Amino acid sequence: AEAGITGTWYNQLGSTFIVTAGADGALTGTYESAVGNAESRYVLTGRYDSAPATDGSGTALGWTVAWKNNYRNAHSATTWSGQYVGGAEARINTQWLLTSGTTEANAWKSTLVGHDTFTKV
Amino acid sequence: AEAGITGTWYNQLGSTFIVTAGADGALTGTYESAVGNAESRYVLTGRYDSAPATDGSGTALGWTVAWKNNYRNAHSATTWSGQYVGGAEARINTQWLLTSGTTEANAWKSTLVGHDTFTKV
């Protein structure tokens, strides 16, 4: 964990995030939806649960991106919840929830659900 | 369970469903989105898991509604997954997934998630 988590991760669709795992549970970094442009970039923040493992368990973690920067304000935020698995083919497997701000009439359509896998390659 | 499940159920928003729980695990009935009109009515089908309980456990169940009838075809289907709890204030507590048919470009926006509680009153 920690050192294994620090670095650049890529999903299937071509989004990228860069994250530092700090000593006491902190995750900080940036998410780029498209690896071309210098602002599809958004701030990310989260937490991971460091633990002694003797059985090859994953490391539980989570992070949030609010979809606002200097070029775009999409009135929404996503959370990813999942686990880090290290080794020669390290990956982070996640499920995600994306919520949009709605009126109260429309609150039943506010939250989409999906899943993502990130690899180092 | 079974006999306790058979009957009319109402959620917070005012939708209604009427269900028969058959002897070997079957749930069949109809869902009306609005209890006024004679077709906001859609077919429902599902299953429940009957079991001897000695500890006051709920009965696990699930059902599907495809949103097509003679007046409307909304190109979508919802599943509800949850449990029946009986007694003087019987309720069914559920979480749901609503999926719309999309092109492959739009498949990340295809599934909404939410929750519902049904009571007899």
Binding site: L13, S15, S33, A34, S40, Y42, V65, W67, R72, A74, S76, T78, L98 | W108, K109
Partner: peptide, 6 residues
């Protein structure tokens, strides 16, 4: 074209 995807 939500920023998560595009």
């Amino acid at each position: 074209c939500h920023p998560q995807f595009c």
